[PDB]
Amino acid sequence: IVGGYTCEENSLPYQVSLNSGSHFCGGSLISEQWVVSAAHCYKTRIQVRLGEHNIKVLEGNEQFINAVKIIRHPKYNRDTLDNDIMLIKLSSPAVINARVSTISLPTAPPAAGTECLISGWGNTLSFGADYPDELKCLDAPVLTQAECKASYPGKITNSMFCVGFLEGGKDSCQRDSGGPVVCNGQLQGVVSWGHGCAWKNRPGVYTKVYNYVDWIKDTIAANS
Ligand SMILES: [Ca+2]
């Protein structure tokens, strides 16, 4: 997250860290045993870390659980990042408490102008790299599809939407990938991609979770 602020400890119970030796992507807990993330965050072996704030220090509220099954969307396109969404089943159900809980699925697509909360342990700089130990937060509005397409001519598909500021300065970034975009208490998006980070006229592009509600429900029911 570039230009954001440090979130209050455990204030985003649904935020998870995907770890493969080190943190590499974010995710969202939507059920005791299921996490939503980005398909480009796929890896053969993944440990899901819940209840985290400072990813380098043991705080006492963490829950480390290995993934038993990783399901990328059938139509995921590695080249265009179309349908960039993935489901992760935990080997065991997470213990739900005050610092670890789930986020709801959207009941309608994101509306332009809506303020959302994006979070992660991703890069905090537009140039160079500075990965934070503590979870970062950013409040940003959903942009119109018009503005989104204008920023990325011929690269925006039906599964994508933009959130951020055209003036730049505030945006998600590398390793925030797979993380949540929550608006009005619902998971509206998944951090997917963008050109640079917080650059002018290059807002973040996110996967529209609403388009996959049925797929998520069916896939989970068939693998639980
Ligand atoms: Ca920790």
Side-chain angles (χ1 to χ4, degrees):
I1 302 290
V2 180
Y5 55 95
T6 301
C7 314
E8 195 171 79
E9 39 286 302
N10 302 300
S11 58
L12 304 184
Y14 55 83
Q15 170 83 227
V16 309
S17 166
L18 300 192
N19 185 291
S20 184
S22 66
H23 170 272
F24 73 90
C25 275
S28 302
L29 189 72
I30 60 171
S31 192
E32 295 98 313
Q33 199 165 183
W34 292 87
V35 167
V36 172
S37 188
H40 79 264
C41 286
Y42 180 78
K43 283 193 176 183
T44 304
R45 191 70 68 279
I46 298 178
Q47 181 180 65
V48 178
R49 299 193 171 191
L50 307 87
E52 287 273 27
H53 184 241
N54 185 315
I55 50 174
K56 290 298 183 301
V57 178
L58 281 178
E59 300 151 297
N61 302 303
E62 303 96 335
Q63 287 185 51
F64 298 164
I65 306 173
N66 295 313
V68 65
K69 188 175 180 60
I70 304 176
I71 306 168
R72 287 171 292 183
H73 190 281
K75 300 181 181 180
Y76 168 56
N77 181 176
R78 178 182 58 62
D79 304 309
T80 64
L81 290 182
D82 192 13
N83 303 300
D84 189 18
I85 187 168
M86 162 181 97
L87 288 176
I88 300 173
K89 183 179 184 180
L90 307 178
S91 55
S92 60
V95 177
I96 302 301
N97 52 52
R99 304 174 189 288
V100 174
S101 56
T102 61
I103 188 65
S104 64
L105 291 180
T107 53
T114 304
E115 183 177 60
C116 308
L117 179 63
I118 304 173
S119 48
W121 289 277
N123 196 354
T124 62
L125 306 174
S126 294
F127 295 91
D130 196 322
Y131 291 99
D133 295 320
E134 289 175 289
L135 182 63
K136 296 293 185 177
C137 272
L138 174 66
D139 295 290
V142 175
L143 300 177
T144 68
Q145 291 297 301
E147 297 175 298
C148 198
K149 294 182 179 180
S151 300
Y152 299 106
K155 295 180 179 300
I156 304 300
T157 67
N158 302 300
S159 75
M160 305 168 196
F161 74 109
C162 290
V163 179
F165 309 80
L166 297 177
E167 56 267 52
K170 295 177 183 175
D171 192 9
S172 53
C173 198
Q174 263 63 52
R175 300 188 194 174
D176 278 322
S177 302
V181 174
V182 173
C183 325
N184 298 168
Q186 304 179 325
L187 179 67
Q188 288 289 356
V190 175
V191 181
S192 187
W193 63 278
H195 288 340
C197 294
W199 290 6
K200 184 178 181 179
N201 297 306
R202 297 299 172 90
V205 183
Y206 303 81
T207 303
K208 193 180 300 180
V209 177
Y210 179 79
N211 291 22
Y212 306 97
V213 174
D214 295 315
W215 176 72
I216 292 176
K217 292 182 177 181
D218 294 317
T219 299
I220 288 178
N223 287 288
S224 301

